[PDB]
Amino acid sequence: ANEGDVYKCELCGQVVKVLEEGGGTLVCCGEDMVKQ
Amino acid sequence: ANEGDVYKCELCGQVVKVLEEGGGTLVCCGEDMVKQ
Ligand SMILES: [Cd+2]
Ligand SMILES: [Cd+2]
């Protein structure tokens, strides 16, 4: 997505800080993680 | 996953450092990201 970003799941509540962007999404709990 | 972990996609190559573990997975590119 964009280095130095954070993605939090709106289901479990998993938060991960992207340190290396790629070209996809973090579908967690069958739901595309949200950005913080 | 447990905090203090990293997840790299085997498609795009997106690396994200889990800040707050959770009961879910980071399905990216239709593939559950792998741990680093
Ligand atoms: Cd990906
Ligand atoms: Cd989740």
Side-chain angles (χ1 to χ4, degrees):
Chain A
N2 271 307
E3 293 185 18
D5 265 48
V6 155
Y7 269 100
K8 174 260 272 102
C9 185
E10 272 267 342
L11 262 121
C12 53
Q14 176 152 237
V15 198
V16 314
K17 177 273 196 107
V18 176
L19 58 285
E20 205 141 342
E21 71 184 19
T25 284
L26 324 156
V27 177
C28 196
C29 288
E31 199 177 71
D32 317 329
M33 207 154 305
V34 322
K35 212 263 155 144
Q36 311 283 270
Chain B
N2 311 60
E3 293 181 39
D5 262 89
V6 151
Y7 272 100
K8 184 253 249 296
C9 184
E10 274 253 274
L11 250 131
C12 53
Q14 174 148 233
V15 192
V16 321
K17 178 271 190 191
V18 180
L19 77 107
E20 269 186 342
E21 72 250 314
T25 284
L26 321 155
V27 175
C28 191
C29 287
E31 217 226 64
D32 60 272
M33 217 126 87
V34 321
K35 224 90 117 276
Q36 312 281 271

Short mmCIF file of all heavy atoms in Angstrom, two decimals:
data_model
loop_
_atom_site.label_atom_id
_atom_site.label_comp_id
_atom_site.label_asym_id
_atom_site.label_seq_id
_atom_site.Cartn_x
_atom_site.Cartn_y
_atom_site.Cartn_z
N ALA A 1 0.84 -1.18 0.00
CA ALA A 1 0.00 0.00 0.00
C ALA A 1 0.88 1.25 0.00
O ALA A 1 0.90 2.00 -0.97
CB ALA A 1 -0.95 -0.04 1.20
N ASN A 2 1.60 1.43 1.10
CA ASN A 2 2.48 2.57 1.24
C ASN A 2 3.28 2.44 2.54
O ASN A 2 2.72 2.51 3.63
CB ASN A 2 1.69 3.88 1.31
CG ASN A 2 1.46 4.45 -0.09
OD1 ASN A 2 2.38 4.64 -0.88
ND2 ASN A 2 0.19 4.71 -0.37
N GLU A 3 4.58 2.24 2.38
CA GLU A 3 5.46 2.10 3.53
C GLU A 3 5.10 3.12 4.61
O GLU A 3 4.58 4.19 4.31
CB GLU A 3 6.93 2.25 3.11
CG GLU A 3 7.37 1.08 2.23
CD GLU A 3 8.86 1.16 1.91
OE1 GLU A 3 9.61 1.87 2.61
OE2 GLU A 3 9.25 0.46 0.90
N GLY A 4 5.38 2.74 5.85
CA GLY A 4 5.08 3.60 6.98
C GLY A 4 3.57 3.74 7.19
O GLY A 4 3.09 4.79 7.62
N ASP A 5 2.87 2.66 6.87
CA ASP A 5 1.42 2.65 7.02
C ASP A 5 1.03 1.64 8.10
O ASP A 5 1.86 0.83 8.53
CB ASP A 5 0.74 2.23 5.72
CG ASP A 5 0.30 3.38 4.82
OD1 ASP A 5 1.19 4.30 4.63
OD2 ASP A 5 -0.84 3.41 4.32
N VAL A 6 -0.22 1.71 8.52
CA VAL A 6 -0.73 0.82 9.54
C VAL A 6 -2.11 0.30 9.12
O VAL A 6 -2.96 1.08 8.70
CB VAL A 6 -0.74 1.52 10.90
CG1 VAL A 6 -1.78 0.91 11.83
CG2 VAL A 6 0.65 1.49 11.54
N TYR A 7 -2.29 -1.00 9.26
CA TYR A 7 -3.55 -1.63 8.91
C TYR A 7 -4.14 -2.38 10.10
O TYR A 7 -3.50 -3.27 10.67
CB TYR A 7 -3.22 -2.64 7.80
CG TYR A 7 -3.35 -2.07 6.39
CD1 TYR A 7 -2.22 -1.67 5.70
CD2 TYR A 7 -4.59 -1.95 5.80
CE1 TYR A 7 -2.33 -1.13 4.37
CE2 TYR A 7 -4.70 -1.41 4.47
CZ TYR A 7 -3.57 -1.03 3.82
OH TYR A 7 -3.68 -0.52 2.56
N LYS A 8 -5.36 -1.99 10.45
CA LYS A 8 -6.05 -2.62 11.57
C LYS A 8 -7.30 -3.34 11.05
O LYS A 8 -8.04 -2.80 10.23
CB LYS A 8 -6.35 -1.59 12.66
CG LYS A 8 -7.20 -2.20 13.77
CD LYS A 8 -8.67 -1.81 13.61
CE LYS A 8 -8.98 -0.49 14.31
NZ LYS A 8 -9.04 0.62 13.33
N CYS A 9 -7.49 -4.55 11.56
CA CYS A 9 -8.63 -5.36 11.16
C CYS A 9 -9.85 -4.89 11.95
O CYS A 9 -9.74 -4.56 13.13
CB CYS A 9 -8.37 -6.85 11.35
SG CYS A 9 -9.70 -7.95 10.73
N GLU A 10 -10.99 -4.87 11.27
CA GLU A 10 -12.23 -4.44 11.90
C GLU A 10 -13.04 -5.66 12.34
O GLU A 10 -14.27 -5.60 12.39
CB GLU A 10 -13.04 -3.55 10.96
CG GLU A 10 -12.64 -2.08 11.12
CD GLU A 10 -13.54 -1.37 12.13
OE1 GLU A 10 -14.63 -1.86 12.44
OE2 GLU A 10 -13.07 -0.26 12.60
N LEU A 11 -12.33 -6.73 12.65
CA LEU A 11 -12.97 -7.96 13.08
C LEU A 11 -12.29 -8.46 14.36
O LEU A 11 -12.91 -8.49 15.42
CB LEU A 11 -12.98 -8.99 11.95
CG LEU A 11 -14.28 -9.09 11.15
CD1 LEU A 11 -14.03 -8.81 9.66
CD2 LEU A 11 -14.97 -10.44 11.37
N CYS A 12 -11.03 -8.83 14.22
CA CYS A 12 -10.26 -9.33 15.35
C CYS A 12 -9.60 -8.13 16.04
O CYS A 12 -9.66 -8.01 17.26
CB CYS A 12 -9.23 -10.37 14.91
SG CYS A 12 -8.12 -9.85 13.56
N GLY A 13 -8.98 -7.29 15.23
CA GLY A 13 -8.31 -6.11 15.75
C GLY A 13 -6.80 -6.21 15.56
O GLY A 13 -6.03 -5.65 16.35
N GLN A 14 -6.41 -6.93 14.52
CA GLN A 14 -5.00 -7.12 14.22
C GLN A 14 -4.43 -5.86 13.55
O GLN A 14 -4.92 -5.44 12.50
CB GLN A 14 -4.78 -8.35 13.35
CG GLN A 14 -3.31 -8.49 12.95
CD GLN A 14 -2.94 -9.96 12.72
OE1 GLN A 14 -2.03 -10.50 13.34
NE2 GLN A 14 -3.69 -10.57 11.81
N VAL A 15 -3.41 -5.31 14.18
CA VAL A 15 -2.77 -4.11 13.65
C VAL A 15 -1.34 -4.46 13.21
O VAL A 15 -0.57 -5.02 13.98
CB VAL A 15 -2.82 -2.99 14.69
CG1 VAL A 15 -2.57 -1.63 14.04
CG2 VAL A 15 -4.15 -3.00 15.44
N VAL A 16 -1.04 -4.09 11.97
CA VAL A 16 0.28 -4.36 11.42
C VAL A 16 0.80 -3.09 10.72
O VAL A 16 0.06 -2.44 10.00
CB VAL A 16 0.23 -5.57 10.49
CG1 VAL A 16 -0.55 -6.72 11.14
CG2 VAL A 16 -0.37 -5.20 9.14
N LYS A 17 2.07 -2.80 10.97
CA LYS A 17 2.69 -1.63 10.38
C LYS A 17 3.50 -2.05 9.15
O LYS A 17 4.50 -2.74 9.28
CB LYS A 17 3.51 -0.87 11.43
CG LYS A 17 4.24 0.32 10.79
CD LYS A 17 5.60 -0.11 10.23
CE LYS A 17 6.48 1.11 9.96
NZ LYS A 17 7.56 1.20 10.97
N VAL A 18 3.02 -1.62 7.99
CA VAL A 18 3.69 -1.94 6.74
C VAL A 18 5.03 -1.22 6.68
O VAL A 18 5.09 0.00 6.84
CB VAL A 18 2.78 -1.61 5.56
CG1 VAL A 18 3.49 -1.85 4.23
CG2 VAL A 18 1.48 -2.42 5.63
N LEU A 19 6.08 -2.00 6.45
CA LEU A 19 7.42 -1.44 6.37
C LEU A 19 7.94 -1.60 4.94
O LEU A 19 8.99 -1.05 4.59
CB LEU A 19 8.33 -2.07 7.43
CG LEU A 19 8.47 -3.60 7.37
CD1 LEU A 19 7.22 -4.29 7.91
CD2 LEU A 19 8.81 -4.06 5.95
N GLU A 20 7.19 -2.35 4.15
CA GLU A 20 7.57 -2.58 2.76
C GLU A 20 6.32 -2.76 1.90
O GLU A 20 5.71 -3.83 1.90
CB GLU A 20 8.49 -3.79 2.64
CG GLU A 20 9.36 -3.69 1.39
CD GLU A 20 10.78 -4.19 1.66
OE1 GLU A 20 11.20 -4.27 2.82
OE2 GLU A 20 11.47 -4.49 0.61
N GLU A 21 5.97 -1.70 1.19
CA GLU A 21 4.80 -1.73 0.32
C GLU A 21 4.99 -2.77 -0.78
O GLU A 21 6.11 -3.13 -1.12
CB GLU A 21 4.53 -0.34 -0.27
CG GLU A 21 5.59 0.03 -1.31
CD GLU A 21 5.37 1.46 -1.82
OE1 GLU A 21 4.68 2.25 -1.17
OE2 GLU A 21 5.95 1.72 -2.95
N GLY A 22 3.86 -3.23 -1.31
CA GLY A 22 3.88 -4.22 -2.37
C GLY A 22 2.92 -3.85 -3.50
O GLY A 22 3.21 -2.96 -4.31
N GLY A 23 1.79 -4.53 -3.52
CA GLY A 23 0.78 -4.28 -4.53
C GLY A 23 -0.46 -5.15 -4.30
O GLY A 23 -0.98 -5.76 -5.24
N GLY A 24 -0.89 -5.19 -3.05
CA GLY A 24 -2.06 -5.98 -2.68
C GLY A 24 -2.71 -5.44 -1.41
O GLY A 24 -2.39 -4.33 -0.97
N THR A 25 -3.61 -6.23 -0.86
CA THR A 25 -4.31 -5.85 0.36
C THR A 25 -4.16 -6.93 1.43
O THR A 25 -3.72 -8.04 1.14
CB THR A 25 -5.77 -5.56 -0.01
OG1 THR A 25 -5.72 -4.29 -0.65
CG2 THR A 25 -6.64 -5.32 1.22
N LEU A 26 -4.52 -6.56 2.65
CA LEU A 26 -4.43 -7.48 3.77
C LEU A 26 -5.84 -7.91 4.19
O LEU A 26 -6.38 -7.40 5.17
CB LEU A 26 -3.61 -6.87 4.90
CG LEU A 26 -2.43 -5.99 4.48
CD1 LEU A 26 -2.06 -5.00 5.58
CD2 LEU A 26 -1.23 -6.85 4.06
N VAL A 27 -6.40 -8.84 3.42
CA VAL A 27 -7.73 -9.34 3.70
C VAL A 27 -7.69 -10.23 4.94
O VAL A 27 -7.19 -11.36 4.88
CB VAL A 27 -8.29 -10.05 2.47
CG1 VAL A 27 -9.67 -10.64 2.76
CG2 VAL A 27 -8.35 -9.10 1.27
N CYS A 28 -8.20 -9.70 6.04
CA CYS A 28 -8.23 -10.44 7.29
C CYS A 28 -9.69 -10.62 7.71
O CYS A 28 -10.48 -9.68 7.63
CB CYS A 28 -7.40 -9.74 8.37
SG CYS A 28 -6.99 -10.79 9.81
N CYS A 29 -10.00 -11.82 8.16
CA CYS A 29 -11.35 -12.14 8.60
C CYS A 29 -12.30 -11.93 7.42
O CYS A 29 -13.44 -11.53 7.60
CB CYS A 29 -11.75 -11.30 9.81
SG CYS A 29 -10.93 -11.78 11.38
N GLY A 30 -11.78 -12.20 6.23
CA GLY A 30 -12.57 -12.05 5.02
C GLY A 30 -12.96 -10.59 4.80
O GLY A 30 -13.94 -10.30 4.11
N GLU A 31 -12.19 -9.70 5.41
CA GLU A 31 -12.45 -8.28 5.30
C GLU A 31 -11.13 -7.51 5.10
O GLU A 31 -10.21 -7.65 5.90
CB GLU A 31 -13.21 -7.76 6.52
CG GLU A 31 -13.88 -6.42 6.21
CD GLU A 31 -14.71 -5.94 7.41
OE1 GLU A 31 -14.13 -5.53 8.43
OE2 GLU A 31 -15.98 -5.99 7.25
N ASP A 32 -11.09 -6.73 4.04
CA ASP A 32 -9.91 -5.94 3.73
C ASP A 32 -9.59 -5.02 4.91
O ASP A 32 -10.39 -4.14 5.25
CB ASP A 32 -10.14 -5.07 2.49
CG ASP A 32 -10.86 -5.76 1.34
OD1 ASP A 32 -10.73 -6.98 1.14
OD2 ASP A 32 -11.58 -4.99 0.61
N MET A 33 -8.43 -5.25 5.50
CA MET A 33 -8.00 -4.45 6.64
C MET A 33 -8.12 -2.95 6.33
O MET A 33 -7.97 -2.54 5.18
CB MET A 33 -6.55 -4.78 6.98
CG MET A 33 -6.26 -4.53 8.46
SD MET A 33 -4.92 -5.58 9.01
CE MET A 33 -5.57 -7.18 8.53
N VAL A 34 -8.39 -2.19 7.38
CA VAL A 34 -8.54 -0.75 7.23
C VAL A 34 -7.20 -0.07 7.56
O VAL A 34 -6.34 -0.68 8.20
CB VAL A 34 -9.69 -0.25 8.10
CG1 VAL A 34 -10.85 -1.24 8.10
CG2 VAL A 34 -9.22 0.04 9.53
N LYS A 35 -7.08 1.17 7.12
CA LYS A 35 -5.87 1.93 7.35
C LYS A 35 -6.07 2.84 8.57
O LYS A 35 -7.19 3.28 8.84
CB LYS A 35 -5.45 2.68 6.09
CG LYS A 35 -3.93 2.82 6.01
CD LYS A 35 -3.47 4.19 6.52
CE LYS A 35 -2.03 4.13 7.02
NZ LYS A 35 -1.32 5.39 6.71
N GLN A 36 -4.97 3.09 9.27
CA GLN A 36 -5.02 3.94 10.45
C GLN A 36 -4.24 5.23 10.20
O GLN A 36 -4.27 5.79 9.10
CB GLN A 36 -4.48 3.20 11.67
CG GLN A 36 -5.13 1.82 11.81
CD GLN A 36 -6.55 1.94 12.37
OE1 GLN A 36 -6.78 1.90 13.57
NE2 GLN A 36 -7.49 2.09 11.44
N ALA B 1 0.12 -15.35 15.40
CA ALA B 1 1.13 -14.45 14.87
C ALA B 1 1.98 -13.91 16.02
O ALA B 1 3.21 -14.02 15.99
CB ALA B 1 0.44 -13.33 14.08
N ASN B 2 1.31 -13.34 17.00
CA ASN B 2 1.99 -12.79 18.16
C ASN B 2 2.81 -11.57 17.73
O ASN B 2 3.56 -11.64 16.76
CB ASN B 2 2.94 -13.81 18.78
CG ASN B 2 2.25 -15.15 18.99
OD1 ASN B 2 1.77 -15.79 18.06
ND2 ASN B 2 2.21 -15.55 20.26
N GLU B 3 2.64 -10.49 18.47
CA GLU B 3 3.36 -9.26 18.17
C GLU B 3 4.83 -9.55 17.91
O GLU B 3 5.31 -10.65 18.19
CB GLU B 3 3.19 -8.24 19.30
CG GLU B 3 1.74 -7.76 19.40
CD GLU B 3 1.58 -6.73 20.52
OE1 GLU B 3 2.45 -5.88 20.71
OE2 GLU B 3 0.49 -6.84 21.21
N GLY B 4 5.52 -8.55 17.38
CA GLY B 4 6.94 -8.69 17.08
C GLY B 4 7.16 -9.73 15.98
O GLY B 4 8.06 -10.56 16.09
N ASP B 5 6.33 -9.65 14.95
CA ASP B 5 6.43 -10.57 13.83
C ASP B 5 6.37 -9.78 12.53
O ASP B 5 6.03 -8.60 12.52
CB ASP B 5 5.28 -11.57 13.84
CG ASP B 5 5.61 -12.93 14.46
OD1 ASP B 5 5.42 -13.02 15.73
OD2 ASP B 5 6.03 -13.87 13.76
N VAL B 6 6.69 -10.47 11.44
CA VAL B 6 6.67 -9.85 10.13
C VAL B 6 5.97 -10.79 9.14
O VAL B 6 6.07 -12.01 9.25
CB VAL B 6 8.10 -9.49 9.70
CG1 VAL B 6 8.23 -9.52 8.17
CG2 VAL B 6 8.51 -8.13 10.26
N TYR B 7 5.27 -10.17 8.19
CA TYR B 7 4.55 -10.93 7.19
C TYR B 7 4.88 -10.43 5.78
O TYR B 7 4.65 -9.26 5.47
CB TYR B 7 3.06 -10.70 7.47
CG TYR B 7 2.46 -11.69 8.46
CD1 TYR B 7 2.28 -11.32 9.78
CD2 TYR B 7 2.09 -12.95 8.05
CE1 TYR B 7 1.71 -12.25 10.72
CE2 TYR B 7 1.52 -13.88 8.98
CZ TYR B 7 1.36 -13.49 10.28
OH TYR B 7 0.82 -14.37 11.16
N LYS B 8 5.41 -11.33 4.97
CA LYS B 8 5.77 -10.99 3.60
C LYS B 8 4.86 -11.75 2.64
O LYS B 8 4.65 -12.95 2.79
CB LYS B 8 7.26 -11.23 3.37
CG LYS B 8 7.67 -10.78 1.96
CD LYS B 8 7.93 -11.98 1.05
CE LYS B 8 9.42 -12.10 0.72
NZ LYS B 8 9.88 -10.92 -0.05
N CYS B 9 4.34 -11.02 1.66
CA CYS B 9 3.46 -11.61 0.66
C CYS B 9 4.33 -12.33 -0.38
O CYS B 9 5.37 -11.82 -0.78
CB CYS B 9 2.55 -10.57 0.03
SG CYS B 9 1.32 -11.24 -1.15
N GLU B 10 3.86 -13.50 -0.78
CA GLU B 10 4.57 -14.29 -1.77
C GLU B 10 4.03 -14.01 -3.17
O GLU B 10 4.06 -14.89 -4.04
CB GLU B 10 4.50 -15.78 -1.43
CG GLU B 10 5.60 -16.18 -0.45
CD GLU B 10 6.69 -16.99 -1.16
OE1 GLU B 10 6.57 -18.22 -1.29
OE2 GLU B 10 7.70 -16.30 -1.58
N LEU B 11 3.53 -12.80 -3.35
CA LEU B 11 2.98 -12.39 -4.63
C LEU B 11 3.56 -11.03 -5.02
O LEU B 11 4.29 -10.93 -6.01
CB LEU B 11 1.45 -12.42 -4.58
CG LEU B 11 0.78 -13.53 -5.40
CD1 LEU B 11 -0.27 -14.27 -4.57
CD2 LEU B 11 0.18 -12.96 -6.70
N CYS B 12 3.21 -10.03 -4.23
CA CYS B 12 3.69 -8.68 -4.49
C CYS B 12 5.02 -8.50 -3.77
O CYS B 12 5.97 -7.94 -4.33
CB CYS B 12 2.66 -7.63 -4.06
SG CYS B 12 2.07 -7.78 -2.34
N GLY B 13 5.06 -8.97 -2.53
CA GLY B 13 6.27 -8.87 -1.73
C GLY B 13 6.11 -7.80 -0.64
O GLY B 13 7.09 -7.17 -0.23
N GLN B 14 4.87 -7.62 -0.20
CA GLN B 14 4.57 -6.64 0.82
C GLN B 14 4.96 -7.18 2.20
O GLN B 14 4.51 -8.25 2.60
CB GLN B 14 3.10 -6.23 0.79
CG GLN B 14 2.76 -5.31 1.96
CD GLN B 14 1.66 -4.32 1.56
OE1 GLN B 14 1.79 -3.11 1.71
NE2 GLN B 14 0.57 -4.88 1.06
N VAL B 15 5.79 -6.41 2.89
CA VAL B 15 6.24 -6.80 4.22
C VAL B 15 5.62 -5.87 5.26
O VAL B 15 5.73 -4.65 5.15
CB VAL B 15 7.77 -6.82 4.26
CG1 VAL B 15 8.28 -7.50 5.54
CG2 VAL B 15 8.35 -7.49 3.02
N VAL B 16 4.99 -6.48 6.25
CA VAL B 16 4.35 -5.72 7.31
C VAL B 16 4.72 -6.33 8.66
O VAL B 16 4.69 -7.55 8.82
CB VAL B 16 2.84 -5.66 7.07
CG1 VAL B 16 2.53 -5.48 5.58
CG2 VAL B 16 2.14 -6.90 7.64
N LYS B 17 5.06 -5.46 9.60
CA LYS B 17 5.43 -5.90 10.93
C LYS B 17 4.21 -5.81 11.85
O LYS B 17 3.70 -4.72 12.11
CB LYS B 17 6.64 -5.11 11.44
CG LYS B 17 7.01 -5.53 12.86
CD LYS B 17 6.25 -4.69 13.90
CE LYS B 17 6.80 -4.94 15.30
NZ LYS B 17 5.90 -4.34 16.32
N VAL B 18 3.78 -6.97 12.32
CA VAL B 18 2.62 -7.04 13.20
C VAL B 18 2.93 -6.27 14.49
O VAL B 18 3.91 -6.55 15.17
CB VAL B 18 2.25 -8.50 13.46
CG1 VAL B 18 1.04 -8.60 14.39
CG2 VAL B 18 1.99 -9.24 12.14
N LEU B 19 2.07 -5.31 14.78
CA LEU B 19 2.23 -4.49 15.97
C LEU B 19 1.29 -5.01 17.07
O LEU B 19 1.62 -4.95 18.25
CB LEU B 19 2.03 -3.01 15.64
CG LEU B 19 0.59 -2.55 15.44
CD1 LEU B 19 0.11 -1.72 16.63
CD2 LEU B 19 0.43 -1.81 14.12
N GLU B 20 0.14 -5.50 16.64
CA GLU B 20 -0.85 -6.02 17.56
C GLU B 20 -1.46 -7.31 17.02
O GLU B 20 -2.42 -7.26 16.25
CB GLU B 20 -1.93 -4.98 17.86
CG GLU B 20 -1.56 -4.13 19.08
CD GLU B 20 -2.70 -3.18 19.46
OE1 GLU B 20 -3.58 -2.92 18.63
OE2 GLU B 20 -2.64 -2.71 20.66
N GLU B 21 -0.89 -8.42 17.43
CA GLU B 21 -1.36 -9.72 16.99
C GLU B 21 -2.89 -9.76 17.03
O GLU B 21 -3.53 -8.92 17.66
CB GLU B 21 -0.76 -10.85 17.84
CG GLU B 21 -1.36 -10.85 19.25
CD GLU B 21 -0.33 -10.41 20.28
OE1 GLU B 21 0.82 -10.88 20.25
OE2 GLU B 21 -0.75 -9.55 21.15
N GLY B 22 -3.44 -10.75 16.34
CA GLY B 22 -4.89 -10.92 16.29
C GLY B 22 -5.26 -12.31 15.77
O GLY B 22 -4.44 -12.99 15.16
N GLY B 23 -6.51 -12.68 16.03
CA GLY B 23 -7.00 -13.98 15.59
C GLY B 23 -7.49 -13.92 14.14
O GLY B 23 -8.66 -14.18 13.86
N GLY B 24 -6.56 -13.59 13.26
CA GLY B 24 -6.87 -13.50 11.84
C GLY B 24 -5.60 -13.63 10.99
O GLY B 24 -4.50 -13.75 11.52
N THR B 25 -5.80 -13.59 9.68
CA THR B 25 -4.69 -13.70 8.75
C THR B 25 -4.71 -12.53 7.77
O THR B 25 -5.74 -11.88 7.59
CB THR B 25 -4.77 -15.07 8.07
OG1 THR B 25 -4.30 -15.97 9.06
CG2 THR B 25 -3.77 -15.21 6.92
N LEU B 26 -3.56 -12.29 7.16
CA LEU B 26 -3.42 -11.21 6.20
C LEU B 26 -3.39 -11.80 4.78
O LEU B 26 -2.31 -11.95 4.20
CB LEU B 26 -2.21 -10.34 6.53
CG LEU B 26 -1.97 -10.08 8.02
CD1 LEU B 26 -0.49 -9.75 8.28
CD2 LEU B 26 -2.90 -8.99 8.55
N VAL B 27 -4.57 -12.10 4.27
CA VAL B 27 -4.69 -12.66 2.94
C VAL B 27 -4.45 -11.56 1.90
O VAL B 27 -5.31 -10.70 1.70
CB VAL B 27 -6.04 -13.36 2.78
CG1 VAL B 27 -6.24 -13.85 1.34
CG2 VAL B 27 -6.20 -14.50 3.78
N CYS B 28 -3.28 -11.63 1.27
CA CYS B 28 -2.93 -10.64 0.26
C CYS B 28 -2.68 -11.38 -1.06
O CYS B 28 -2.03 -12.42 -1.08
CB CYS B 28 -1.71 -9.82 0.69
SG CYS B 28 -1.38 -8.35 -0.35
N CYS B 29 -3.21 -10.80 -2.12
CA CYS B 29 -3.06 -11.39 -3.44
C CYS B 29 -3.72 -12.77 -3.43
O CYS B 29 -3.29 -13.67 -4.16
CB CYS B 29 -1.59 -11.46 -3.87
SG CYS B 29 -0.84 -9.85 -4.31
N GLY B 30 -4.74 -12.90 -2.60
CA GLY B 30 -5.46 -14.16 -2.48
C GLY B 30 -4.56 -15.25 -1.89
O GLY B 30 -4.78 -16.44 -2.14
N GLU B 31 -3.57 -14.81 -1.13
CA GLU B 31 -2.64 -15.74 -0.50
C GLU B 31 -2.28 -15.25 0.90
O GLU B 31 -1.82 -14.13 1.08
CB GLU B 31 -1.39 -15.91 -1.36
CG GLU B 31 -0.89 -17.36 -1.31
CD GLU B 31 0.62 -17.42 -1.09
OE1 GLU B 31 1.11 -16.98 -0.04
OE2 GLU B 31 1.29 -17.94 -2.07
N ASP B 32 -2.52 -16.13 1.87
CA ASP B 32 -2.22 -15.81 3.26
C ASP B 32 -0.73 -15.50 3.40
O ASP B 32 0.11 -16.38 3.25
CB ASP B 32 -2.55 -16.99 4.18
CG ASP B 32 -1.77 -18.27 3.88
OD1 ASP B 32 -2.32 -19.05 3.01
OD2 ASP B 32 -0.70 -18.52 4.45
N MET B 33 -0.45 -14.23 3.68
CA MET B 33 0.93 -13.79 3.85
C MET B 33 1.72 -14.77 4.72
O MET B 33 1.16 -15.39 5.62
CB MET B 33 0.94 -12.41 4.50
CG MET B 33 2.07 -11.54 3.92
SD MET B 33 1.40 -10.00 3.31
CE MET B 33 1.47 -9.03 4.81
N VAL B 34 3.00 -14.88 4.41
CA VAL B 34 3.87 -15.78 5.15
C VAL B 34 4.63 -14.98 6.21
O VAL B 34 4.73 -13.76 6.12
CB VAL B 34 4.80 -16.52 4.19
CG1 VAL B 34 4.05 -16.92 2.91
CG2 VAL B 34 6.04 -15.69 3.87
N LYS B 35 5.16 -15.70 7.19
CA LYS B 35 5.91 -15.08 8.26
C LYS B 35 7.39 -15.00 7.88
O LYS B 35 7.88 -15.86 7.15
CB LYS B 35 5.66 -15.81 9.59
CG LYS B 35 5.44 -14.81 10.73
CD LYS B 35 3.96 -14.46 10.87
CE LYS B 35 3.41 -14.91 12.23
NZ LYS B 35 3.01 -16.34 12.17
N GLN B 36 8.04 -13.97 8.37
CA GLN B 36 9.45 -13.77 8.09
C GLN B 36 10.27 -13.83 9.38
O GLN B 36 10.66 -14.92 9.82
CB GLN B 36 9.68 -12.44 7.36
CG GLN B 36 8.71 -12.29 6.19
CD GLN B 36 9.18 -13.10 4.98
OE1 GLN B 36 9.93 -12.63 4.13
NE2 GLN B 36 8.70 -14.33 4.94
CD CD C 1 0.10 -9.17 -2.16
CD CD C 2 -8.93 -10.37 11.31
#
